[PDB]
């Protein structure tokens, strides 16, 4: 029927003076644009069809052509920035926003989807969608007593589009738009659908990827406990964004980090730091590194939860990127920790894996490790035990690696190496 039309037949139907012929041709275009492989988006654009589709969005009297054109334009907008731009340049934004209030749920949903692609292109189209007034009607679609009465796919599409209104930086979304969206986001974060939860967590992770004021906007809404709970979820698509959001939050102030600790987050890190998914391990170790950069009482919470042995484990064996994050966590720990906490660190076995990582080619991890060693030696000086630590390093082959690093081409590297040798190995 409307299957496998040529673009020229589509054009001929759309240019007819017959609304029903236009509808059939538009459905044919929709079917071309929704096929598995290589939708002919550029051919459709070049045929000049976008303004026709946009005009069809306004035909309240023929809801089927509204739907077909909305779907066609959705899929054009799903392509490259230039293809999305063609949709925007056709005037689609206000027309889709007008369709959000449609009495036909499938049409409103299609408009939600299209606005999600447009806003998802980037900060500029995101903010232009916002300026056209999309947030109010989008949120009105979610103003129901119980989200469970909404169709599952409908709610997932709304959540994803809102997450695109929260996404991207340079600039980040307008502060007032974030404040407007956040309560609905908090509500979606307690919904029981795994995809809604995943995308709500992604939105929160975007909103916390910024300066402390943005983090504070999120933390003030009281979502950290729910984020920790979701951090313990079994579905990896939920754990990943929840953990990203938590890590972002602990890049903030020590009080914000403390809200992560108070919510129980550390109790999850034995599993996270041994998680079989490499990216979970990496992100959890980065999170830890930004917790050990905090206050001594927070370092002490890391100690109490038994997480130093897990950091020793990741330093001993993990993907190299995770090992680099672990080195960072250790240097932060040693820079901020009390003497007793650093002693504890040594008693957990940090020295040998720390030394074994000095044979790595990455310059920055070498610097990080040498810093950590210096800090530990400083604690040993305060205890008068530099000799015992020197013996430790010598027995595991670390002295050979440092003395070798004296010949390292990097400046700060061979400087710190020389200082360690002449100061503690003479």
């Amino acid at each position: 029927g409307t299957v496998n039309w040529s673009v020229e037949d589509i054009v001929k139907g759309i240019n007819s003076n017959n609304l029903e012929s236009q509808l059939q041709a538009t459905q044919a275009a929709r079917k071309l644009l929704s096929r598995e492989k290589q939708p002919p988006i550029d051919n459709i654009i070049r045929a000049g069809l976008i303004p026709k589709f946009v005009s069809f969005l306004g035909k309240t009297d023929c809801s089927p052509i509204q739907f077909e054109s909305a779907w066609a334009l959705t899929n054009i907008a799903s392509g490259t920035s230039e293809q999305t731009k063609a949709v925007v340049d056709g005037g689609a934004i206000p027309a889709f926003i007008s369709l959000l209030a449609s009495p036909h749920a499938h049409i409103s949903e299609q408009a939600v989807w299209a606005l999600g692609n447009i806003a998802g292109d980037g900060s500029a189209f995101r903010d232009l969608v916002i300026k056209h007034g999309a947030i109010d009607p989008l949120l009105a679609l979610l103003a129901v007593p119980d989200l469970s009465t909404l169709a599952c796919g409908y709610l997932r599409n709304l959540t994803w589009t809102l997450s695109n209104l929260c996404r991207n930086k340079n600039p980040a979304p307008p502060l007032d738009a974030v404040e407007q969206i956040l309560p609905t986001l908090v509500r979606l974060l307690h919904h029981n659908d795994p995809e809604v939860l995943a995308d709500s967590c992604w939105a929160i992770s975007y909103l916390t990827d910024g300066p402390n004021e943005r983090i504070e906007m999120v933390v003030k809404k009281g979502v950290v406990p729910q984020l920790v709970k979701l951090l313990g979820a079994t579905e990896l698509p939920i754990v990943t964004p929840a953990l990203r959001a938590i890590g972002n939050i602990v890049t903030g102030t020590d009080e914000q980090t403390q809200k992560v600790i108070d919510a129980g987050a550390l109790a999850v890190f034995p599993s996270l730091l041994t998680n079989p998914k490499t990216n979970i391990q990496k992100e959890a170790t980065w999170t830890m590194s930004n917790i050990t950069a905090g206050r001594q009482d927070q370092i002490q919470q890391v100690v109490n939860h038994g997480l130093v042995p897990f950091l020793v484990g990741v330093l001993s064996k993990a993907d190299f990127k995770t090992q680099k994050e672990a080195a960072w966590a250790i240097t932060n720990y040693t820079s901020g920790g009390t003497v007793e906490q650093i002693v504890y660190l040594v008693h957990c076995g940090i020295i040998e894996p720390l030394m074994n990582l000095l044979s790595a080619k990455d310059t920055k991890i070498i610097q990080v490790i040498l810093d950590a060693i210096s800090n530990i030696f400083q604690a040993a000086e305060k205890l008068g035990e530099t000799e015992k630590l020197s013996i430790m390093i010598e027995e595991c082959g670390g002295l050979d690696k440092i003395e070798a690093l004296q010949r390292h081409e990097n400046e700060s590297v061979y400087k710190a190496s020389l200082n360690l040798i002449e100061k503690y190995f003479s």
């Binding site: 644009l33 929704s34 096929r35 598995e36 939708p39 779907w71 959705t74 899929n75 907008a77 799903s78 392509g79 999305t84 299609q110 989807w113 999600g116 692609n117 998802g120 292109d121 994803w160 695109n164 996404r167 991207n168």
Partner: peptide, 8 residues
Amino acid sequence: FPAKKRKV
């Protein structure tokens, strides 16, 4: 992951 989705 990509921000856009095509309806298939």
